[PDB]
Every structure is written in C-alpha cells, then in structure tokens.
Amino acid sequence: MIKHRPHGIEHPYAVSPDQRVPVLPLAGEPVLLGVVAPEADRVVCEWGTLELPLSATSAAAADAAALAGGEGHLSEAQADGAWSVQTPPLAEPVKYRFHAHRGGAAESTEWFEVSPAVWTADGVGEVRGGGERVRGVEWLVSSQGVHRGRFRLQLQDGDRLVGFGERYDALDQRGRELDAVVFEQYKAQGVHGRTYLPMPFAHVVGADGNGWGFHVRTSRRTWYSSAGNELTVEVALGDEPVVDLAIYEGDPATVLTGFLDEVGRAEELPGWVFRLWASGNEWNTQQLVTARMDTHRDLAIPVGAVVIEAWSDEQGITIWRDAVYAVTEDGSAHRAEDFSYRPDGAWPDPKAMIDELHARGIKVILWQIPLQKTEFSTGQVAADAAAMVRDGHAVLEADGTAYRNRGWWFPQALMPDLSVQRTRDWWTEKRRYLVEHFDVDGFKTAGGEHAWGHDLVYADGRKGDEGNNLYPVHYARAFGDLLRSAGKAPVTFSRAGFTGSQAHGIFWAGDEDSTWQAFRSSVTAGLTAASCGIVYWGWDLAGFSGPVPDAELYLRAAAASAFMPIMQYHSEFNHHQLPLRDRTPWHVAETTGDDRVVPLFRRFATLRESLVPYLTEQAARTIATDRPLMRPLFFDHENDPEIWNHPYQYLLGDELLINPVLEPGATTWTTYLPAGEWIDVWTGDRVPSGLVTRDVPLEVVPVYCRASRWSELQPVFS
Numbered sequence: 045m046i047k048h049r050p051h052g053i054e055h056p057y058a059v060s061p062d063q064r065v066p067v068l069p070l071a072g073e074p075v076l077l078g079v080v081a082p083e084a085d086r087v088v089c090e091w092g093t094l095e096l097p098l099s100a101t102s103a104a105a106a107d108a109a110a111l112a113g114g115e116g117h118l119s120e121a122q123a124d125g126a127w128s129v130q131t132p133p134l135a136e137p138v139k140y141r142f143h144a145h146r147g148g149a150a151e152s153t154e155w156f157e158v159s160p161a162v163w164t165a166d167g168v169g170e171v172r173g174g175g176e177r178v179r180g181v182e183w184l185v186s187s188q189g190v191h192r193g194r195f196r197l198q199l200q201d202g203d204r205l206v207g208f209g210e211r212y213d214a215l216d217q218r219g220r221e222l223d224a225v226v227f228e229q230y231k232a233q234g235v236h237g238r239t240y241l242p243m244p245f246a247h248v249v250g251a252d253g254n255g256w257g258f259h260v261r262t263s264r265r266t267w268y269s270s271a272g273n274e275l276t277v278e279v280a281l282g283d284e285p286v287v288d289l290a291i292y293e294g295d296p297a298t299v300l301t302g303f304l305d306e307v308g309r310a311e312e313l314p315g316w317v318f319r320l321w322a323s324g325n326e327w328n329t330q331q332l333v334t335a336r337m338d339t340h341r342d343l344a345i346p347v348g349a350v351v352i353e354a355w356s357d358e359q360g361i362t363i364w365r366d367a368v369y370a371v372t373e374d375g376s377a378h379r380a381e382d383f384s385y386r387p388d389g390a391w392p393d394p395k396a397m398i399d400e401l402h403a404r405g406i407k408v409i410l411w412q413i414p415l416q417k418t419e420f421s422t423g424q425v426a427a428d429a430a431a432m433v434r435d436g437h438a439v440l441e442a443d444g445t446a447y448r449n450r451g452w453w454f455p456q457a458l459m460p461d462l463s464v465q466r467t468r469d470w471w472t473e474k475r476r477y478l479v480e481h482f483d484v485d486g487f488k489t490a491g492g493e494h495a496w497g498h499d500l501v502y503a504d505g506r507k508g509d510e511g512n513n514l515y516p517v518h519y520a521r522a523f524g525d526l527l528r529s530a531g532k533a534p535v536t537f538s539r540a541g542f543t544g545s546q547a548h549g550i551f552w553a554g555d556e557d558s559t560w561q562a563f564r565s566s567v568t569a570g571l572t573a574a575s576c577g578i579v580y581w582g583w584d585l586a587g588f589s590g591p592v593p594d595a596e597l598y599l600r601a602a603a604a605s606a607f608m609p610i611m612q613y614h615s616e617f618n619h620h621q622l623p624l625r626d627r628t629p630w631h632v633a634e635t636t637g638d639d640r641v642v643p644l645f646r647r648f649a650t651l652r653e654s655l656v657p658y659l660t661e662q663a664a665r666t667i668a669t670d671r672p673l674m675r676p677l678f679f680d681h682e683n684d685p686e687i688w689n690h691p692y693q694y695l696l697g698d699e700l701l702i703n704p705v706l707e708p709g710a711t712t713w714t715t716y717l718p719a720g721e722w723i724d725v726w727t728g729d730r731v732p733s734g735l736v737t738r739d740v741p742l743e744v745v746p747v748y749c750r751a752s753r754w755s756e757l758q759p760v761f762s
C-alpha cells in the first residue's frame with residue numbers, strides 16, 4: 045500500500061510525511077514529495093515524462109514532534125515507513141503519480157497534479173477600502189486561479205502596531221513576522237509567536253498625526269510583516285479575488301469602536317465573575333471538590349467560582365461520572381430524571397454539592413470540549429456519534445464523510461457542526477439538564493482549534509479555509525446561548541477564538557509552564573486581547589503545568605492577577621500521582637515550605653473582593669465607551685512616547701495604574717506615571733508624574749490611583 049496526500053494532515057505550522065512540500069510551489073521552486081509506504085522494497089515517482097527514484101526518509105522531522113503536539117507534549121528527541129524525493133524546479137503544471145512494489149508485487153497511486161504559482165500586479169482582483177494607505181497590490185496566481193492577495197500599508201516613524209488578537213511575544217508587533225490562524229500551541233506561545241485567539245485587526249498608533257486601525261474582513265488565514273515604513277499584509281483567498289479592508293480613524297478607543305461596531309462587543313457579565321476563580325484538574329470527585337472548597341472556607345480565602353474539569357464520564361462529556369441511566373439508542377438528549385447517582389460513585393449527590401456551594405455564594409463551572417469521541421464502540425457516546433453522522437450534525441470532509449480529528453488531542457473524534465442553529469441546539473440540548481436542573485452557572489469551553497483542512501464542509505455553506513477559524517466563535521456562542529435560554533448570563537470560559545469572539549463570554553490565556561517568561565507572556569496576551577476588544581480575560585496565575593511554582597513567582601503572579609479582569613488559579617492533570625500539583629495557596633505553601641504564601645494570598649483575595657464594585661463599574665464603562673478594562677497606556681496617552689518603554693504596565697479601568705513585578709529577586713520596582721496626579725495606594729501619599737521607584741516586598745505590587753478619584757478607591761486599600 046502507498047499513500048500520498050498533497051495537502052497532508054494540514055497542521056497549519058507543520059508538514060506530514062505523506063505530502064507535497066510546499067503544497068503550492070512558486071514557479072522555479074523545486075518540490076519535495078513525501079509518501080508513506082510502510083512495506084515497499086522500492087518507490088518511484090512518475091513525474092511528468094520523468095521517473096524519480098525515492099529515497100527512504102521523511103520530511104522531516106522536527107515536524108513529527110509538532111504533529112505530536114509540539115515540544116511541550118513530546119520528547120523522545122527522536123524515534124518511519126516514509127519515502128521522499130526532491131523534484132526538478134517547477135516550470136509548469138506537472139501531473140505525477142507513484143509506483144511502488146514489495147518483492148515483485150506492485151501498486152500505483154492515483155494521478156496528482158500541481159501547478160506552479162507566481163506573484164503579479166496584473167489581474168481582475170481588487171483590494172477595496174484602504175484608500176491611499178494601500179500600495180503594492182499583488183496577486184498569487186496559477187493555472188488554477190488566484191490563491192492569495194498581498195499589499196502594503198504605509199507606516200510613519202513612531203508608529204506602533206498593536207493588535208492581531210491575543211499575542212504572547214510583544215505588545216508592539218512592528219518589525220516582526222506573524223500570521224492570524226487559530227492554532228493550539230501547547231505552552232511557550234510567546235516563543236513560537238502563535239495564538240489560540242488571532243484577529244486580522246490592529247491599531248496603528250503613535251505617529252504625530254491621529255492614529256488609525258484596520259480590519260481585513262476574512263476568516264481565512266492572513267500573514268503580516270513590517271520592515272521600514274511599510275506593513276505587508278498577505279491574504280488567503282476563496283473563489284473571489286477580492287480583499288475587503290476596513291479602515292478606522294480616531295483615537296485608539298474610537299478605532300476600537302469602529303471595529304467592535306462591525307464585529308461585535310462584550311455584553312455586561314454579572315459582577316461575580318470578578319471574584320476569585322478556583323480550579324484544578326485532579327479534583328475529580330464530589331469528595332475532592334467539597335474538600336478543596338472547605339479548605340478555602342476554613343482558611344478564610346474567598347472564592348467566587350469553582351471550575352470542575354473532570355466531572356464527567358470522560359466519554360460524551362455531558363454526563364456526571366458514574367451516573368446510571370438507560371442509553372438512548374437514537375442519540376437523543378437525556379432528562380435529569382433519566383439519571384440516578386449511586387452512593388459509592390464519584391458523584392453520589394451532585395445537586396446537593398452545587399446547592400451547598402451556591403449557599404456559600406460560589407458559582408459552579410463545568411468543563412467542555414466540542415468533540416465526540418469515536419474510540420468507544422458502545423454506549424451513549426457511540427449512539428450519539430452515529431446520530432451525528434446520520435442526522436448531519438457532524439462537520440464534513442470534502443467527500444461527504446464526517447471529519448475525524450487530525451490533531452494530537454483526542455484524535456479521530458467528530459466535531460459537532462456548530463455553524464448552524466439546529467446542530468447548536470442538538471449539541472447543547474444534551475447539556476440542558478445541567479443548567480436547568482443542576483443550576484450550573486457556566487461552562488469552561490476548552491478547545492475548538494481541532495478543525496484542520498481547507499476543503500472541510502460546514503452546514504452554513506463555508507469551507508474549511510474560511511470556516512475553521514470561525515469554529516471557536518460558534519462554540520462559545522452555542523454554550524452562551526444555552527445559558528441564556530435557561531435565563532442565565534452567558535458565562536463561557538474559552539481559550540480559543542477569532543474575530544467576533546468579543547461578544548461571547550470569558551477568555552483565559554491557555555496552557556503554560558510556571559516560569560517568569562510565561563508570566564510576562566500572559567500579561568502581553570491580556571493587553572493585546574484587550575486592545576482588540578476582549579474584555580473579560582484572565583490566565584492561570586503562575587502557570588498550571590509542570591511542578592508547583594515557587595512562592596515568589598506564585599505571589600508575584602497572584603498580586604498582579606488581583607488587578608486583572610479575571611483572577612484564576614489552575615493546575616494540569618498529573619495522573620493522580622502524589623505529591624499533588626495543585627496550585628491552591630495552601631498546597632503551594634506546603635510544597636515550598638513558605639509561611640508567607642497563605643496569608644499574602646488571602647490579602648490579595650480579600651482586596652480583590654473589595655474591588656468587585658469598581659471592576660463592575662469599569663467593565664460597564666468599557667462596554668459603553670470601548671476604552672479597555674485592561675488598558676495599555678496608548679489609549680489615553682497616545683502622544684506620550686515614553687509609554688512604549690514600559691509595555692507591561694496598564695490601567696485597570698480609568699482610575700488605576702498597575703505595574704506587575706515580572707522578575708525574580710526584585711526588591712525595588714520602577715513605574716512610569718504619565719500625565720496626571722497620582723497617589724500610591726499603599727501609602728496614600730501623593731506622587732509626581734514620571735519615573736517612580738518604590739519597595740516591592742511580596743505583599744506589594746506597584747499600583748497608583750488618579751488623585752481625583754482616590755477618595756472612592758481609598759476604602760478598598762485601607
């Protein structure tokens with residue numbers, strides 16, 4: 045047997061051994077041809093009129109690590125039935141196929157074709173809307189059609205580029221190469237410069253004149269680079285060679301208003317989301333969740349929400365673990381009364397647990413994935429999978445078969461097609477009893493990045509090249525709507541999204557190690573996301589992955605996060621080994637032996653509770669004025685050049701300036717205070733504008749209040 049798939053697995057940053065590299069060669073480029081034929085003595089390619097012998101070797105891989113989820117998931121530095129050959133350069137369309145044989149038994153692949161492409165300024169295609177800001181329009185064309193547009197936006201000296209969704213490497217992207225595509229990068233997002241939540245939108249800000257911004261209106265992939273005075277924008281295309289480009293003019297907030305008016309905006313969430321969120325993945329039973337929350341109560345560390353990740357049967361992920369019930373063969377949803385819960389099960393009485401948590405004022409959030417596992421051939425999970433295919437609730441391959449997940453996380457799983465209302469209904473209907481009976485307050489909607497390939501088909505008419513980036517938006521929206529339909533606020537908690545995600549729930553920065561570098565990246569992620577209109581945002585403070593963080597990093601992160609839109613701690617699945625990897629304050633104290641951790645965390649959490657009315661009012665202003673909640677200084681201060689030397693500072697709402705302590709061992713910290721009158725919130729003293737240095741013991745993160753509103757904020761800090 046011999047396999048060749050010209051596009052391959054379509055990992056957006058990687059190639060697979062069965063494919064053509066590159067998929068679309070420029071004219072003059074050679075192409076590398078991979079093929080997988082596990083048992084073959086010899087493999088040849090019939091390439092045009094030539095015959096090209098294949099060596100046994102693969103492309104390549106550092107890409108196989110990538111296909112396994114990247115370095116965070118896999119090493120195994122090394123350790124495949126793969127063959128490859130490099131062709132002559134491509135001067136024209138070539139038809140090719142492959143011939144292989146094992147010891148005198150031969151096979152032939154189907155014919156394939158590849159047409160070389162060239163960049164040209166000549167064409168019927170147009171870039172609409174950029175006015176005189178756009179120069180150098182070119183199109184990437186082949187005998188097949190127009191594949192991509194490209195053009196340049198004029199920049200002025202002093203201009204910064206801030207935007208592009210949620211970014212972990214830098215606030216200002218000028219001088220860098222980046223793209224916008226939804227991808228799950230497992231940790232080290234800043235290092236790779238990738239993101240779960242890209243947007244083809246940015247602020248152009250800081251030149252003497254008034255600033256502006258742009259939105260490429262596409263859900264297809266886009267690429268960006270800036271050198272000298274130009275920003276280069278490359279746009280993947282569908283059948284129509286048109287790029288529609290929106291330009292917004294004004295101060296940064298007004299620029300944002302134009303964008304959000306077009307693509308959507310946050311609505312006001314209940315004030316309780318501003319309290320502390322407690323989480324960890326290994327709280328997998330009723331006993332564990334109640335024990336952890338009891339410890340919160342007993343240590344007097346206030347918590348407003350608890351996330352339960354492994355709550356479920358781990359199959360369909362819509363039923364409590366150990367619940368007993370009659371499987372519905374037709375794949376229909378269950379009523380609450382379908383279920384009974386055994387005394388010895390993982391969750392003997394989940395309603396009583398939730399009622400008690402509610403009585404203490406703690407909200408409850410359940411984990412979700414937009415995936416139906418196929419690895420089980422029996423039970424409810426299998427009945428629902430069959431129902432998805434039968435009734436058309438599954439995202440489809442070009443050939444009409446159901447898409448099977450190509451990623452490393454739950455491979456082969458189906459994706460519910462959330463692009464249309466009927467399937468959004470069907471999928472969330474299975475979760476309805478959780479909200480209506482069990483009174484669950486939210487969903488942590490994890491994942492959403494799983495759709496790979498350009499020719500996938502969605503029921504809304506879109507193909508995968510357009511629709512795959514949109515999928516996480518549909519995903520958050522679906523569960524938001526479930527909550528609304530039960531009369532509850534649309535609180536979804538999501539890592540992934542795209543243009544339009546602004547209007548659905550809450551977002552967290554995703555998976556990271558516990559390191560100062562990850563801490564710094566996360567701040568940048570919140571700042572850039574806010575610049576694009578993502579209002580309720582948080583991260584896993586001091587990281588959820590690997591060994592428990594040291595006291596210093598933990599407390600630095602906790603202090604800063606108390607000043608961020610969403611304060612949450614979290615911990616990754618450890619295989620239930622001992623010792624625990626919990627990120628709870630008391631387990632961190634236990635692990636480090638540091639007796640400052642619990643009392644100082646308590647103070648931060650206690651101050652946090654006092655900040656809820658302020659955060660609530662500021663959130664409402666953010667939603668009304670589009671001036672961000674976690675606010676880079678260029679929004680109010682844009683003509684001040686000095687602000688760009690302190691990219692990790694921000695305004696929390698109008699009145700408070702925050703300066704996270706981002707390095708280990710720091711006994712002092714310097715803050716740049718822009719034009720205005722300031723007050724150190726810890727001493728209540730007046731402070732002048734400009735650079736200000738103060739001591740930073742662990743109980744302090746630098747915070748300053750506008751003098752005129754300090755009367756309102758003073759009780760919070762007393």
Ligand SMILES: OC[C@H]1O[C@@H]2OC[C@H]3O[C@H](O[C@@H]4[C@@H](O)[C@@H](OC[C@H]5O[C@H](O[C@H]([C@H]2O)[C@@H]1O)[C@H](O)[C@@H](O)[C@@H]5O)O[C@H](CO)[C@H]4O)[C@H](O)[C@@H](O)[C@@H]3O
Nearest residue numbers: 113228230325353354355358453490539554555615616617
């Ligand atoms: O990159 C894929 C994935 O990696 C991590 O999970 C790998 C893990 O998946 C399966 O076990 C999971 C378990 O890890 C946990 O997942 C909750 C987790 O999901 C997201 O992060 C994961 C990594 O943990 C990432 O997507 C999310 O961002 C994070 O906040 C969450 O904590 O719990 C679920 C449910 O119990 C479990 O299915 C798989 O079984 C396991 O073998 C694999 O190592």
